[PDB]
């Protein structure tokens, strides 16, 4: 899932 400032799913 989305981890602010680290990982943003498509």
């Amino acid at each position: 899932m989305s981890l602010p400032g680290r990982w943003k799913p498509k």
Partner: antibody
Amino acid sequence: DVQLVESGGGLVQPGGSRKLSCAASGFTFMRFGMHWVRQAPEKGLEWVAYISSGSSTIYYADTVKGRFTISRDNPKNTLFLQMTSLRSEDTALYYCARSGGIERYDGTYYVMDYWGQGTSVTVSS
Amino acid sequence: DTVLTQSPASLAVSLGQRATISCRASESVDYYGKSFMNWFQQKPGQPPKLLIYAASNQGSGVPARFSGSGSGTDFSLHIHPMEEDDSAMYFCQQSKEVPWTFGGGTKLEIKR
């Protein structure tokens, strides 16, 4: 291309306050989350604070959480770090680094891809 | 926080040889099939530069001599062949959890 220039550092008395700026150019500033990282004399890198492109998400290091405030002014292409209650242990070179997104077939991994030269903060009387 | 133990604290490698730096995480940095492990090169008086992101992906202007491997809590940065301007401080970092953490760093010097 992408240029980040910090400024505002200097000598500050313990318990003092100081605002640092980070001027961005060469990219679409409003599109990137930004960080402040510090490096104490003869020390490693220590993450200080983070701010999303639109300021919705802000994260701080525990030792900084109450005294330091991170903010940005997208129209002016500038990132700030407001420091208060400066402690000797805040003496360090402060860098602003960009949070660059890298595209994968499934998402975008973020990392501090560009760093500035930094500003030196000396907390001493 | 997930603590990163970086070894060795320093090393000296001859030109042409491989220099490997290791980094152990207190907690796995794996997240959704990826490893949130990054490595930076910091030249004296200079800002850090991204080398490897996501454990084994080379950054923008990064030579093929710079590689990275590992997953979970076990990670290494490899530099082969070692060249003249490689002498510098290197740091691992995890981007899975907040706060972002860095290894203690390792001073890589040319053994002459």
